Design a protein around this ligand. Structure first.
Ligand SMILES: [Ca+2]
Ligand SMILES: [Ca+2]
Ligand SMILES: [Ca+2]
Length: 354
């Protein structure tokens, strides 16, 4: 089954080429379920016309109002106000953004709004087969926006609290989440070995039944160098390109569980360079893009068979992955089990007599 969206043909990651995830075969089984919820734990969302119908009420765990860029600390509105950082902000020695992002040489730089959470959310669940824009992996699934990244990023504590809340666990000062998510997408990370703050939250949500999918990182470095990609009990995802080859930037190593489309990925975005402006579509690169191909595939796996455990989900993802092509720059010790194949991973529960 294929959707009719105008730009779907440019979304090679969904197609059945050597590098693609082979979604049309999966979509013959299921195009998702509104009872399966994927949490996009990220910069927040824009109510893009090609996305908003699949977005649930979420939460905003950014504690610092300066980073939050929305007039307050934690709040119940996960809309993305923009995460831009001006040159004056990053260079102000008396300001809250001083040297908050540095390049290879240790020099500060400025950035426009990324709308990164809107791009990631569109890969999971853009409104599909509606004759416009892009498609998502789960056409009918719901997306729980959990905003944890603001101007110059986010804090470990806010991200770990967002993780707990996303899965339906308690966080002090936050209301209960009536839409617990069974798949949690983390297209983010930072340096250092896996903090106990992350590992405690991960183990709590996994035991609650959630699958945690995390970007391996973009430093052409060992995946051991980036958390939460280097944590236990997560699915770390490396990025490959349209030819099934290792992305130049992807982190690699023994902890990577699978590779997925992460180069030239078209999805929903916004045209604003600071505050929100018009809906748009944009092509991004990163392990951030590979991660929602895997998380969306899990959402379809659960729509097709709601009884699968996180352990069974990982085993099926890896067993159904395609071997890396010759000359890919990938191996099963560096890029996970193979190339993501949703068409092979998604399997309907058994039918039975009545
Ligand atoms: Ca706020
Ligand atoms: Ca907010
Ligand atoms: Ca669409």
């Amino acid at each position: 089954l294929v959707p009719n969206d105008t730009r779907y043909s440019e979304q090679w990651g969904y197609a059945s080429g050597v590098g693609g995830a082979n979604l049309p075969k999966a979509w013959d089984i299921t195009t998702g379920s509104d009872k399966v919820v994927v949490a996009v734990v990220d910069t927040g969302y824009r109510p893009h016309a090609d996305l908003a119908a699949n977005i649930l009420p979420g939460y905003d765990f950014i504690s610092d109002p300066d980073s939050a860029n929305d007039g307050n600390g934690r709040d119940n509105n996960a809309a993305d106000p923009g995460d831009w950082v001006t040159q004056q902000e990053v260079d102000d020695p008396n300001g809250p953004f001083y040297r908050c992002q540095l390049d290879q040489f240790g020099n500060t730089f400025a950035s426009n709004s990324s709308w990164h959470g809107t791009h990631v959310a569109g890969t999971i669940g853009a409104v599909s087969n509606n004759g416009t824009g892009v498609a998502g992996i789960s056409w009918k699934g719901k997306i729980l926006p959990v905003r944890v990244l603001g101007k110059c990023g986010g804090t470990l504590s806010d991200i770990a609290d967002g993780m707990r809340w996303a899965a339906g666990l308690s966080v002090p000062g936050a209301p209960a989440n009536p839409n617990p998510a069974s798949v949690l997408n983390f297209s983010l990370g930072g340096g250092g070995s896996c903090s106990r703050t992350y590992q405690n939250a991960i183990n709590a949500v996994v035991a609650k039944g959630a699958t945690v999918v995390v970007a391996a990182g973009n430093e052409a470095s060992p995946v051991s160098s980036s958390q939460p990609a280097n944590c236990q009990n997560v699915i770390a995802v490396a990025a490959t390109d349209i030819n099934g080859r290792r992305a130049s930037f992807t982190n690699t190593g023994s902890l990577v569980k699978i590779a997925a489309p992460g180069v030239n990925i078209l999805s929903t975005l916004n045209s604003g360079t600071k505050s929100p402006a018009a809906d748009s579509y944009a092509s991004y690169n990163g392990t951030s893009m590979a991660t929602p191909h895997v998380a969306g595939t899990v959402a379809l796996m659960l729509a097709a068979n709601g009884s699968l455990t996180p352990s069974q989900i990982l085993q099926k993802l890896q067993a159904s992955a395609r071997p890396f092509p010759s000359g890919s720059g990938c191996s099963t010790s560096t890029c996970g089990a193979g190339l993501l194949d949703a068409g092979a991973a998604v399997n309907a529960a058994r039918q039975h007599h009545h």
